[PDB]
Amino acid sequence: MRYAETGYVLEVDLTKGSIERVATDPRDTELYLGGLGTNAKILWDRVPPEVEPFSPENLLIFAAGLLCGTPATGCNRTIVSTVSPQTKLMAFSMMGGFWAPELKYAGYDKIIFRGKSPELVYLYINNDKVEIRDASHLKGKGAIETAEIIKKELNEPRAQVAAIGKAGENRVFYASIEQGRSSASRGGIGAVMGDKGLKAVVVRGTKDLCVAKPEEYIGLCNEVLDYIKHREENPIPDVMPILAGLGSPQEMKVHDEKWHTENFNWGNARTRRKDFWTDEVSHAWEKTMDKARTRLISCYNCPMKCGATISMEGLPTYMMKCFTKLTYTMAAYSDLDFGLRIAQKATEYGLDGFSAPQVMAFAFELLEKGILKDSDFPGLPEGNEERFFYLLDKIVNRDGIGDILANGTYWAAQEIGNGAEDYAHNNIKKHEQLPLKLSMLNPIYYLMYCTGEKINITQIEGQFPQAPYPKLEQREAFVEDWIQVPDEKFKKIFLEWEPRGEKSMPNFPTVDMCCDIVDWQEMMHYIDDALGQCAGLSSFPLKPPYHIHNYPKFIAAGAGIEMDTEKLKKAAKRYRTLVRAFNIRRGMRRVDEQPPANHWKNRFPELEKELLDSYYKLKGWNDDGIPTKETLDDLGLGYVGDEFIKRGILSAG
Amino acid sequence: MRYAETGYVLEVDLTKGSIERVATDPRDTELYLGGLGTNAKILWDRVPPEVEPFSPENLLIFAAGLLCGTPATGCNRTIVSTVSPQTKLMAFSMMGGFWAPELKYAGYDKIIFRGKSPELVYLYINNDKVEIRDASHLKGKGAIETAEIIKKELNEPRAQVAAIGKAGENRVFYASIEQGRSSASRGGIGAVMGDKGLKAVVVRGTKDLCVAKPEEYIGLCNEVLDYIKHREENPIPDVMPILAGLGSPQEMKVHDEKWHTENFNWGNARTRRKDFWTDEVSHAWEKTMDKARTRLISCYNCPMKCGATISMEGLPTYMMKCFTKLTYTMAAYSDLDFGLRIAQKATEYGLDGFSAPQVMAFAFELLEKGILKDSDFPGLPEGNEERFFYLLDKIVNRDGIGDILANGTYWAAQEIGNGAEDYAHNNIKKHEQLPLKLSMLNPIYYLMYCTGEKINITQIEGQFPQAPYPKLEQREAFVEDWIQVPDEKFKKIFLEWEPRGEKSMPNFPTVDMCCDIVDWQEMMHYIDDALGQCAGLSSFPLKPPYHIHNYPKFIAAGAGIEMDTEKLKKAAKRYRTLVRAFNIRRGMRRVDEQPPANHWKNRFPELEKELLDSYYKLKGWNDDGIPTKETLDDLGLGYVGDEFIKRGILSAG
Amino acid sequence: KKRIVKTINIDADKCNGCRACEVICSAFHAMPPYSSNNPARSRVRVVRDPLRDIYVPLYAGEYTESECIGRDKFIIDGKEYDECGFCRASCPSRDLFREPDSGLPLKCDLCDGEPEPLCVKWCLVGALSVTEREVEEPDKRTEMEIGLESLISRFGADVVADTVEQ
Amino acid sequence: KRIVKTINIDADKCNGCRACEVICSAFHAMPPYSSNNPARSRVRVVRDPLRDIYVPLYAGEYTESECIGRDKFIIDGKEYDECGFCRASCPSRDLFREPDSGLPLKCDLCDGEPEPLCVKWCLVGALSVTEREVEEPDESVKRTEMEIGLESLISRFGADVVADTVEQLT
Numbered sequence A, B: 001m002r003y004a005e006t007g008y009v010l011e012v013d014l015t016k017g018s019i020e021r022v023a024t025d026p027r028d029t030e031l032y033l034g035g036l037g038t039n040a041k042i043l044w045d046r047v048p049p050e051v052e053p054f055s056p057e058n059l060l061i062f063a064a065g066l067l068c069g070t071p072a073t074g075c076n077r078t079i080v081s082t083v084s085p086q087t088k089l090m091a092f093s094m095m096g097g098f099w100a101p102e103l104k105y106a107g108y109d110k111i112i113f114r115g116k117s118p119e120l121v122y123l124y125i126n127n128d129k130v131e132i133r134d135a136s137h138l139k140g141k142g143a144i145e146t147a148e149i150i151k152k153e154l155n156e157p158r159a160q161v162a163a164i165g166k167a168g169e170n171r172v173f174y175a176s177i178e179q180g181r182s183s184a185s186r187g188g189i190g191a192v193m194g195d196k197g198l199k200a201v202v203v204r205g206t207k208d209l210c211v212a213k214p215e216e217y218i219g220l221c222n223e224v225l226d227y228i229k230h231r232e233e234n235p236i237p238d239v240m241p242i243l244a245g246l247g248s249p250q251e252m253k254v255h256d257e258k259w260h261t262e263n264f265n266w267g268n269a270r271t272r273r274k275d276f277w278t279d280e281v282s283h284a285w286e287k288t289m290d291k292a293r294t295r296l297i298s299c300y301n302c303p304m305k306c307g308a309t310i311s312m313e314g315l316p317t318y319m320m321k322c323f324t325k326l327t328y329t330m331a332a333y334s335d336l337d338f339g340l341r342i343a344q345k346a347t348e349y350g351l352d353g354f355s356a357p358q359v360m361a362f363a364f365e366l367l368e369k370g371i372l373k374d375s376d377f378p379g380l381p382e383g384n385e386e387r388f389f390y391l392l393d394k395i396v397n398r399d400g401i402g403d404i405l406a407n408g409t410y411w412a413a414q415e416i417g418n419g420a421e422d423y424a425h426n427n428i429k430k431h432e433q434l435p436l437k438l439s440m441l442n443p444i445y446y447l448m449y450c451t452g453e454k455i456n457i458t459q460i461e462g463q464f465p466q467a468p469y470p471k472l473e474q475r476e477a478f479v480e481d482w483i484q485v486p487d488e489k490f491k492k493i494f495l496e497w498e499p500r501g502e503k504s505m506p507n508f509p510t511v512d513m514c515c516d517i518v519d520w521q522e523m524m525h526y527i528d529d530a531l532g533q534c535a536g537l538s539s540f541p542l543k544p545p546y547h548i549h550n551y552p553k554f555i556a557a558g559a560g561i562e563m564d565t566e567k568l569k570k571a572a573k574r575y576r577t578l579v580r581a582f583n584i585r586r587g588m589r590r591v592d593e594q595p596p597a598n599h600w601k602n603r604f605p606e607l608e609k610e611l612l613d614s615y616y617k618l619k620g621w622n623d624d625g626i627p628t629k630e631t632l633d634d635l636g637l638g639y640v641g642d643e644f645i646k647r648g649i650l651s652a653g
Numbered sequence C: 001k002k003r004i005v006k007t008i009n010i011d012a013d014k015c016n017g018c019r020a021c022e023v024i025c026s027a028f029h030a031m032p033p034y035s036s037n038n039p040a041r042s043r044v045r046v047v048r049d050p051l052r053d054i055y056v057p058l059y060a061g062e063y064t065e066s067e068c069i070g071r072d073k074f075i076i077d078g079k080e081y082d083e084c085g086f087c088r089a090s091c092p093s094r095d096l097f098r099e100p101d102s103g104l105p106l107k108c109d110l111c112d113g114e115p116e117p118l119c120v121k122w123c124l125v126g127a128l129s130v131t132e133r134e135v136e137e138p139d140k141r142t143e144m145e146i147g148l149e150s151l152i153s154r155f156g157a158d159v160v161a162d163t164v165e166q
Numbered sequence D: 001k002r003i004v005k006t007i008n009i010d011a012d013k014c015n016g017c018r019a020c021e022v023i024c025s026a027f028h029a030m031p032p033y034s035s036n037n038p039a040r041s042r043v044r045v046v047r048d049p050l051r052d053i054y055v056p057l058y059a060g061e062y063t064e065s066e067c068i069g070r071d072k073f074i075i076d077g078k079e080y081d082e083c084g085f086c087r088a089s090c091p092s093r094d095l096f097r098e099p100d101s102g103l104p105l106k107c108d109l110c111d112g113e114p115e116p117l118c119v120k121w122c123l124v125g126a127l128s129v130t131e132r133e134v135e136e137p138d139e140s141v142k143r144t145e146m147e148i149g150l151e152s153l154i155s156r157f158g159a160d161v162v163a164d165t166v167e168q169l170t
Ligand SMILES: CC(C)(COP(=O)(O)OP(=O)(O)OC[C@H]1O[C@@H](n2cnc3c(N)ncnc32)[C@H](O)[C@@H]1OP(=O)(O)O)[C@@H](O)C(=O)NCCC(=O)NCCSC(=O)C1=CCCC=C1
Pocket: A249, A263, A323, A434, A436, A438, A439, A440, A441, A442, A445, A457, A458, A466, A467, A499, A500, A501, A504, A505, A506
């Protein structure tokens, strides 16, 4: 038999209403592992570059990670993949909670949607029984609201529902998919779902999910739980609480937000407020947070409880974790109470809480500069808060000016013209970045911003510390029990790294050290996204319970395939390279791989050129960022190299 | 068999530790009914007048009402009786809740305690099993606290506990007995219980309790429930909410206390505050009450939920109903928040909330006048509130000055001398009255104050309205459905009665009308106190579900004895006369039957003489207030008349 | 195609702890009816502790011949409830829902044959009500075989075979 | 004197993760840990984030009959489900029954193992089990799981049907 994976996918043609269960090729598991990797294989060989994001031939894939549904702590992620309407590159998007384990218990690893339904429908899965249901009665309803109505309809209180809100139905380019306290948030995956006329995917599963080596697997799981206990008794010394332990950023538990409010830019990634965090602010936001927070709650099979139910007076309850706590507050120069209220609305509409606040702040800078007129904003209230609420509603309905803003800052400015493009100053590959505008070029971060296929900095960093300790003795204490490094050299790099002097950035770590660090950090993210493992226990925090040394053991005990540390590094390199190839085939080149012009005050063009040159070399790519025929062949990706040649992307010899 | 009554009592000699079950004489039920009546029979012929209140020969009797433990709504009262250490007359004292029905389900109608235990003990009853247990580990504990410890000790979570607090153990003359949300409060019954070394009486019963005519009985019960529903849909027009419906005064549900605060005297029954009830006060006390009130709760088998659990920050939960809500507040010129806090302390100590606040206010008027010195109050705090708390603790320990004050205002002043007696201005028969000092002589109230054997005005009034309606049409509407009157003449009296003019008090109602009203009002109280019926559904509110016309049917269907309206009036007259005889035998005479000198501003000595003369005549007493040989014989109380003669109380012919 | 399930709706937030329900249910089930009452024989029993603010009417449910291996005890919204506090079973571990003299099991039958539940009638504050709905009864001999295969796997063919013969 | 065990459940500390369902089902797979399946868990969490209800329920005694009336509580503003606190392995619902056979499930506190596994995996510490001696004798008729399983099939399917199927399987 197969283990850990169920070995089956659902193929759904929404145009025809046909549904088919199909066995998967076990060879694909050995090569590409699962989750993101096998999504990338499917997209490569079924979605050629002439396919547009809202064409019926675009695929929307829901994948459960390889080890989802097994007893591994926190292994519960869904990976949604499609071609993004905003970036026109691959979009993959991760969702925690309970949905991917339920799909596994129902018997499936993926659902693959093609075509478009003429009428709004939802898909209903209960073990072997799969059917398309009319959803016209749900038109416009919020994503959580929709889940609750369906569960009552079907009499399935234990079913897990992934749904879009009105923003997804109206194809907003940053519409999300929502499931309880979890969100596939970014790249427009909710827009593609809405385009296909798909309101929700409802699943219930009550079958067994088997692992290959039972005692060895549960053994590894217990070792993880012991490490979690110990790690939480030993936060990283001198690191802020939101980042000192395990989990997603622990923003729902911590009230102190000095680091965020004083180092991140307010407005349209525009304004540093150096001394924002006063006594009055601290006490006022703590009062808001204490009243609003109902309970800290976990995803499936995890003790970390990063998320929270949030209850604002007069508003339905919703669920929140991590940075959207602050993004609306900050984009609108407001307070935490405003943040939590508008986030309720935006969560039900199903909007990305990273891009949406910046699109609205971008808007008001245009209105401000006069590039947009007051006549483009019919009935625009006086109050600033009320203006954000107003504009939110115009956007999710693609109404008038909202119709342009619904396309994101890149497309909206391009459409608007009149120097509007100057104010879309925070994009990479057409995708909004974190609102961070720092002083000194950071050579590690430079590489991650340029090359990251998620195009989001919080989803490629983590395993190497963000900053050096001032004192050698702190560095010695840190590297002491740092078992997660692939190689001793990572300890030595951190030991020499200093905040100031000849061993400080941008000149140290060296170019070769920076490439190695970025490669290791990224690799861990790709491994998480194939297995379904929450990055909260792996690739995101310092010193995680899951790492490159025990992951191969989880894969071998769980899935019953051969795995060791080298084979795993190579598998991660393989589908990370395949994701790169897919974007190359869609037109991406070195030219696209540059951070915003104003991202650092101090730039070093010769050093930046040498970093990207060396990093491409490490990856085994062209100096145009294309994977070479040699490295493709070595990875078992010869078919990619053959197609590159045939398409003129690579030159034969 | 016998019905409704179990036909058995427990006789306990605490000196010897002997316990005996004894069958009762069914002839006593026909004559004296049950509860208070058969208590009075026992006291008359076992407690002669040479017996002192703290002598071992004084009896303490716990009685369940005749119909307690039957399905009759709200029929759940315990009647505690003994000779009072304060008044040296009979003390009977009623307790609601759950205890008397439990005693019935255990198989008993009364427990009779004689003697004194050398060591602190409690009595434990479980059906047939009865035993005396050591209670030394409970010494000093509060009455509720004690109940909870015992129930855990015994593993009897469904047991009902009647207990004393430290005040009862130290023989404070106004110590109470406490059981859940219920209290045998007044006349010093808790002092006698403490004197006998008895800490608590714990009972559990799980036997059947039978009635004589099953369908007729449950039929009457259902008629009562229908009348309750209807009556609560029709409050008495123009009467304040606390008194407009059924139940004890509904002070736990109503926040408006204008009538009490502006008409009753603050301090040592001293001060009228005509305009106390402002907007600020109303809102402030409502805030306190809303926060403090956990739940409105009922006694056994009743829907009225007059009482409340009360939870003050930092204090254990306790239970409250009716006027002790205000007595502490008012005696101390303070607020409702202070009232609820000190009442918690006093309830656990087990003190009468009527006399105790007046004894402390009496104290501070002495300290004020200089009749008492500051040296009599060692460490006396500055704050007024803190002074009440201080003095409360000195009293329950009989410590120094507390030792004198623990005897009540009458004895304390008498001991103190130096014109202290002038300040004990609110007693009748040595017993503190309600803090009410009104302007015009009320001829109905005058009679009730002079002659009431409970010596408490709130426990003899009720069936006739406290005041007349201004308009004839309101009077006509009221008497229309007034089915509870014994006779039509009571309607006609109320129809002619007016607030002002020639048909106003003190001259109207006439002397004969006033005697009839007082007789009817009192009779209903005696009937309640024999049956166990809460006065909340009978003798206390206007237009009750239980009344003189259906009570005989309850008695005949329940207890299986012959009963009609005339026989019931005569039975009530019989043991009300026997209670009078017992107090006559203890030295009481006409001279003792006078309200406080300052109770009304306008007095009418010839009218007051004619009222008492005529009322004695109605009762069939002497002009010295002694029952005559003729009326005693007619009531089957010949043995009383014989003894009166033999003792020189009556003169033969 | 479908059957009627009846649901006792219990609003414990409206209960005042009066125990009128125990009085009337026991009285009705006396013999003859209303000849006596005895709350230990009620099919409804109220969990009552004013000091914990707990007032929970509990209805007699199913008979069990044995106790649980472990008894559950909840803290919910700050209230510490009793061990087995919500259980309806007539169970050897306690006296609830068992005749006080014989110990035989009692079960609420919704005053079967009467116009209305007597405990609901006498709850003048309206804490209690009973309602109905239709539900679809079952479709299942596959389940029998899967269940025996399961017991053979957990306990072995020879243990299952000798057991079925008795 | 005998020992009684109490499963203490602080529902105020529960975060709805359901790790407890994961480990109990894993351990009771055959062989142990070769699979898992929350529907085979002897601990089942009532979980509704929108009602703020998080209540671990442990499987208890088998009943072959439904009650005449089902109960449903409002407590402290919360509307709980019908039969929402019942431990019974009862024909009215799937809880505490094998999802493919309807066989009864019953918590035995991981009998024979060093410690209750749900408690061990509940790292926030919502669950614990304590012990105490009582004087009351155990009056339970102690039937084995094996005996309870078979007897339930025989009620549902018939003694002759069950016996025949068994002979045909051995
Ligand atoms: C962000 C951070 C606090 C920046 O620290 P700093 O403020 O110190 O950096 P700075 O602004 O560049 O320079 C300050 C001053 O020093 C000077 N100077 C500089 N170098 C110098 C040298 N070598 N020698 C001498 N002087 C040197 C500069 O010129 C400047 O001087 P100025 O006042 O005169 O203008 C730090 O944590 C970091 O490095 N992060 C990593 C990168 C990153 O983006 N991380 C965030 C990723 S997202 C994330 O994590 C989450 C998102 C959502 C929620 C979950 C988590």
